[PDB]
Symmetry: C3
Subunit: 384 residues, 3 copies
């Protein structure tokens, strides 16, 4: 059904990853994932057979409310990251721990401190970050999970644990790096930023990190093709950082839609008519070719370009769109949606738009759990 | 009811035109047009009387799905254009053939190649574009349609038939230009770009067209007053091109609302609270002054500024807003909407928002076919 | 409940003001205001006790339609301002008269001339602005009202009473200033602009005002923190104007939401996920810390910073949100909301969105009329 062009220069070690952080709560809500034949098959088995060497997991320090009701988004905590890393190691895939350093979503607008860290001074907030990182990674490695990468923040574009000063922000990053660097010399320290379209942003960030002597190994970028610029920019800006500051580069989040349809009753973020550059048809091929070309752009940077991660490759519907009341009840109980009512105290946007998945049409599996043909793009970049 | 300030510098042959491409789908759906007295009258009779010398038609190569179902938007093909061009030529009106070179709406965001050309290579695309242009213009000429202009694309702001490369785009542009130039030395070659407000865009576009040696006679702009900036800009950016690159200039699309109301039950594009600069009142007089002032801005270029086309002056409601279900039938069955469901395969936006006209409140005819007093702006710009 | 950080630089006569222009229509809709103990108490008493020293009122020349149906927004006229100002002076508060010189909302996009002045020529409009200012302030001053401040226009960013030409704008500004100057030497002539984030804007405006010899005393800015940029911009740009042209600076409108929730059934204007910079929590404390921070940004200007006015601190709901049909009647028949259907003739945005309050979550009073802790920010800015 799907054919994609061969990407030139892919290493054998090129990181073909997926962030499946929603898996547990989907599974806690009775989602079932099959294979191409229609037989039940663990998503991580299917993922292996498709060529994926890596899994990315988000960790929130307390993604739950006062009475324990979960904020949503898969209620991603250490326990779920430990399960996912266990499941990922069994299937022969290395892990990336995306520490939000927040009790819920961290983006460029929302980089809130955890509730526990809210009342602390900059000095004490610095040591909790260090301890949280250290202790969390330590329990992970006790459960023999292969971590090749740890991320100090998610889209820390000018904010990080409540701080807007780059000087305070850099000091916080080095605390995470120190924990990582003490846990193992061979866990790469990843830094995550988005909006690569904005002119000069990635050059200025990289300077500011160098001027404030942050120890990082990978400068990572979100490149969602509908919001984050031309493919050429990605390669060029990523090249600058790697070539000028002798760092590695990779893409931490990409995704493209395969259907205009919604599978759960909660509006999905793309396609949309006004705010998004849609250069690839909204079909399963167009999806696959965007994943291909993002892999090419990272590759075209050079030996610096080391990988691409897809983001939520299976936030599939917990139920058909008609069964919304039933779906809502699942979303609230197990946080199988993007957010739940219980996040309204912590994330303003959740109060208004609590619900299900906004990415069920940008997943690489179909609404009923069987894999789409676009999931085979991670093999096809080496072949064609 | 309405008066307007005279425009100085209007040539006897100044192009006072309207793009009435919805007429056939509206007529097939039961919409009927009248005169000011109130008796039934063909829109081209009324239009001729109002002083219009030109009609503009859009041509999509196959504006239909596989089973023959129209994409909507008037289901505009060669056949509907030939009808319109004959009807126009009967009423003393020259025709402008706007080739989208797509199977649906072509805009800066969407320049999807025709389904047949989608699987072609660059060299074949270039050959088909020539042939389609030559054959299509030939059929019209055989029917003795008087064609004065042909557009090679619609708002080709850095896209054209699936191409984002200005070298490749100009090559494709020249293909059409050749067919026009072979058919007659007396059919002007219009090139259509939009967003005049953006600083430097029309100057850089014109430069690329000279560097890559494109043959065009007219540099056309879209100027909807709510989206595209000052009247002074339009005149200056169109003048620069005219005197620097020795080309003529015109406005190919302009519209303004006369009511805030919706007449068909599909949300209208303007007026809007957030995104639009509405400097004229949303009244029939406000409409008329907007048009007059866009006619003056073009005439303020001088002898290069050759005309103003109003876009969809008569996309009037196929049924009252309370007859929506009956309207949905006509919208789908006859293409009397902006897009039907059958475009969801080609246009992502159609699946989300299929339905009727969003420019019914910007028409120079009222909801029930009777010409508005603003239709005489084309008359009054000379008398005063 | 709430604490705030003290502000250094704070005169004894620093202006701690509120725009309570919605009060009569809300009171005319049975909205009732209480104290902190649940005991009915005039809003102006509670306002006085909270540290507030100033009230701002908005004057529309005819906030009503043809048949006397009020446009909305508090149906604010000279009579309502004389009531509000009277009640202001009784509770020890000086007044600011914001003249929109429009029959409804005056903003950067909408600066419509009053209906009576709409058919007038430029010169007649200058006398009419002058008489209106003179006679309106004369009636006020005959009722004991202490006017310390008169504002000529509301956010006159390139448009004022119908004119988009800075030359004609300035002449009109000098018309009102004269009548204030002719009313009393001590009343302060305020000029009001918004979007300070845009680079160059306030410095540009300030030259034009000086180059065209406008008599003003205060350069006033709108600073809503979710749309208008950094606090350092506010201080910088206000500093520059005040130090470069020897004027005074102040913030005339600022506000921040205390709840995600709506109280009256009409969508509120912030918080919003899609397009705003919310850097304070959507809680009463975050509200309080925002107001403090805009006081410190004005304070940081120097002695030029003369105060900050909170906007509509009490546009609380007429009735709980489920009571929508019953609410509409009050909004429509008392102008208890931002606009009513009768305004659709004058302001297009009213046709689409006529209704109730979009600031009810940004009020310093709760949904049931009791003060919120943040209303005491004006006390705590000197204490801590
Ligand atoms: Ca969904
Ligand atoms: Ca409509
Ligand atoms: Ca409301």
């Amino acid at each position: 059904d799907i054919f994609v062009k061969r990407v030139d220069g892919l290493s054998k070690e090129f990181i073909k990853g997926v962030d499946v952080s929603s898996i547990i709560a989907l599974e806690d809500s009775g989602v079932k994932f099959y294979n191409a034949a229609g037989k039940k098959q663990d998503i991580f088995k299917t993922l292996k057979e498709a060529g994926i060497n890596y899994v990315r997991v988000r960790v929130w320090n307390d993604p739950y409310d006062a009475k324990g009701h979960g904020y949503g988004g898969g209620n991603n905590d250490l326990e779920k990251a430990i399960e996912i890393g266990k499941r990922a190691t069994a299937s022969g895939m290395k892990l990336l721990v995306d520490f939000h350093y927040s009790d819920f979503w961290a983006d460029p607008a929302k980089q809130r401190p955890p509730k526990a860290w809210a009342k602390l001074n900059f000095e004490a907030k610095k040591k909790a970050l260090y301890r949280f990182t250290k202790e969390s990674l330590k329990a992970m490695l006790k459960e023999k999970i292969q971590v090749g990468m740890v991320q100090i923040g998610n889209e820390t574009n000018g904010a990080f644990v409540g701080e807007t000063d780059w000087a305070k922000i850099c000091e916080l990053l080095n605390a995470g790096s120190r924990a990582v660097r003490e846990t193992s010399p061979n866990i790469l320290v990843v830094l995550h930023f988005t909006n690569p379209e904005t002119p000069g942003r990635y050059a200025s960030i990289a300077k500011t990190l160098a001027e404030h002597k942050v120890d990082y190994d990978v400068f990572a970028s979100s490149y969602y093709p509908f919001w984050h610029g031309t493919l050429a920019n990605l390669t060029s800006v990523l090249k600058y950082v790697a070539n000028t500051y002798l760092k590695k580069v990779m893409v931490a989040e990409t995704s493209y839609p395969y259907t205009t349809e919604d599978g759960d009753g909660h509006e999905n973020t793309a396609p949309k008519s006004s705010g998004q550059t849609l250069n690839y048809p909204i079909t399963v091929q167009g999806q696959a070719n965007a994943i291909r070309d993002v892999i090419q752009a990272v590759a075209a940077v050079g030996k610096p370009g080391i990988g691409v991660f897809y983001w939520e490759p299976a936030w599939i519907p917990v139920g058909p769109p008609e069964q919304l009341k039933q779906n809502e009840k699942k979303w609230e109980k197990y946080g199988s949606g993007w957010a739940s009512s219980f996040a309204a105290e912590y994330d303003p946007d959740a109060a208004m738009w609590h619900g299900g998945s906004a990415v069920d049409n940008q997943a690489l599996f179909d609404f009923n759990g069987r894999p789409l043909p676009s999931l085979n793009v991670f093999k096809y970049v080496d072949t064609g």
